């Protein structure tokens, strides 16, 4: 009943913000530009510093014209509307949002520890306890999101930041969507796509549980279970129902992975009558204190090294390009609700 009441309150609070989203809560000239932290085909993520408080933030800047051209309008509206409405210990917080003549802006908490992707590639692979610590946080985060009728749709190491306590902060909600029932958009990242996405089916939250299987495999092995030069070759492996496990994987890990990487979505853990409890009660998680993880009381396997809230040493170097704001409004109608 404790979990039920928790999720009931979580949904109440989410829906109130969902129905009345915040808008226009800062402006660009409140911030100093520090560094480019990431890029995409229609925007960039910057480290910025607020000029009055001195606080650092990560500012995602999306070019409205490129969002229109790449048919990402709905996805960008989803992203901001969801982010401003959610609240969970392992989700990055949206602090401000605004738009101008050219761009959309989401100003988020800055996590100086960097992406799990970098740490995993540096270390090689995580031990099972280390992978399990991160996996437990994703399980709880998906329990939360799915209870709000939200599908995340982009789980992968690049989207998981490691905070000062060594815990996960999920970011990059660009494909997240509120869905009752099924949805159809082809989106995600190839190595992490469930078979039903590849096969152009109507799909549901089970795709997130498939992606968790991919993530756990990748964390524990050091490479993803389905890999190839061309996406088509990846997709053939995904739909085949065949995966090879390293000998060092425990029996419990292999068993959990066969049930998450279940090609038949009607038999996949997380999508059965017992829902998330088939995962939480699996033997691989027998040592996990779910409440202690939620309360951030478990000592983390790994604390990223950084010097302070402005340190960027865990992020990569990108060309520093101008961020121009047109003298004239672009695509105003399309982004009215942002
Ligand atoms: N990796 C690529 C990704 C990215 O860099 N996201 N970073 C988010 C972030 C949030 C909060 C933070 O505290 C930190 Br630090 C980083 C991306 C880049 C450009 C456009 C788009 Cl749509 C997505």
UniProtKB/Swiss-Prot annotation:
Where in the cell does this protein reside?
Cytoplasm; Cell membrane; Membrane; Nucleus
The alphabetized UniProt keywords are: ATP-binding, cAMP, Cell membrane, Cytoplasm, Kinase, Lipoprotein, Membrane, Mitochondrion, Myristate, Nucleotide-binding, Nucleus, Phosphoprotein, Serine/threonine-protein kinase, Transferase
Q: Which residues carry this modification: Phosphotyrosine?
A: 318
Q: Name one Pfam family in it.
A: Pkinase
Enzyme class per UniProt: transferase
From its record, what is one biological process in GO terms? negative regulation of TORC1 signaling
State if Phosphoprotein is listed as a keyword. yes
**Could you tell me which residue ranges the Protein kinase domain spans?**
31-285
Question: Any inhibitors or activators noted?
Answer: Allosterically activated by various compounds, including ATP. Activated by cAMP; the nucleotide acts as a dynamic and allosteric activator by coupling the two lobes of apo PKA, enhancing the enzyme dynamics synchronously and priming it for catalysis.
Major site of localization recorded for this protein:
cytoplasm
Q: Where is the active site?
A: 154
AGC-kinase C-terminal domain ranges (all copies) = 286-338
Protein known as: cAMP-dependent protein kinase catalytic subunit alpha
């Amino acid at each position: 009943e404790s979990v039920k009441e928790f999720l009931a309150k979580a949904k109440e609070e989410f829906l109130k913000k969902w129905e009345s989203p915040s808008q226009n809560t800062a402006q660009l000239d409140h911030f100093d530009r520090i560094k480019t932290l990431g890029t995409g085909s229609f925007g960039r993520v910057m480290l910025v510093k607020h000029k009055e408080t001195g606080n650092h933030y990560a500012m995602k800047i999306l070019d409205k014209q490129k969002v229109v051209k790449l048919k990402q309008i709905e996805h960008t509206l989803n992203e901001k509307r969801i982010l401003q409405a959610v609240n969970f210990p392992f989700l990055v917080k949206l602090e401000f949002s605004f738009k101008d003549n050219s761009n959309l802006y989401m100003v988020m908490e800055y996590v100086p520890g960097g992406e799990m992707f970098s740490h995993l590639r540096r270390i090689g692979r995580f031990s099972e306890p280390h992978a399990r610590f991160y996996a437990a946080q994703i399980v709880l985060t998906f329990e939360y999101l799915h209870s709000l009728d939200l599908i995340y749709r982009d789980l992968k190491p690049e989207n998981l930041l490691i905070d000062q306590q060594g815990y996960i902060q999920v970011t990059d909600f660009g494909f997240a969507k509120r869905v009752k029932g099924r949805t159809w958009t082809l989106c995600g990242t190839p190595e992490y796509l469930a078979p039903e996405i590849i096969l152009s089916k109507g799909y549901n939250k089970a795709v997130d549980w498939w992606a968790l299987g991919v993530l756990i495999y990748e964390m524990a092995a050091g490479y993803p279970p389905f890999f190839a030069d061309q996406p088509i070759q990846i997709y053939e492996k995904i739909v085949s129902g065949k995966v090879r496990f390293p000998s060092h994987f425990s029996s419990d890990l292999k068993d959990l992975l066969r049930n998450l990487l279940q090609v038949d979505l009607t038999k996949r853990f997380g999508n059965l009558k017992n829902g998330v409890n088939d995962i939480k009660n699996h033997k691989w998680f027998a040592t996990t204190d779910w409440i202690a993880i939620y309360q951030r009381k478990v000592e983390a396997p790994f604390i990223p090294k950084f010097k302070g809230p402005g340190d960027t040493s865990n992020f990569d170097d990108y060309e520093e390009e101008e961020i121009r704001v047109s003298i004239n409004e672009k695509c105003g109608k399309e982004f009215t609700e942002f």
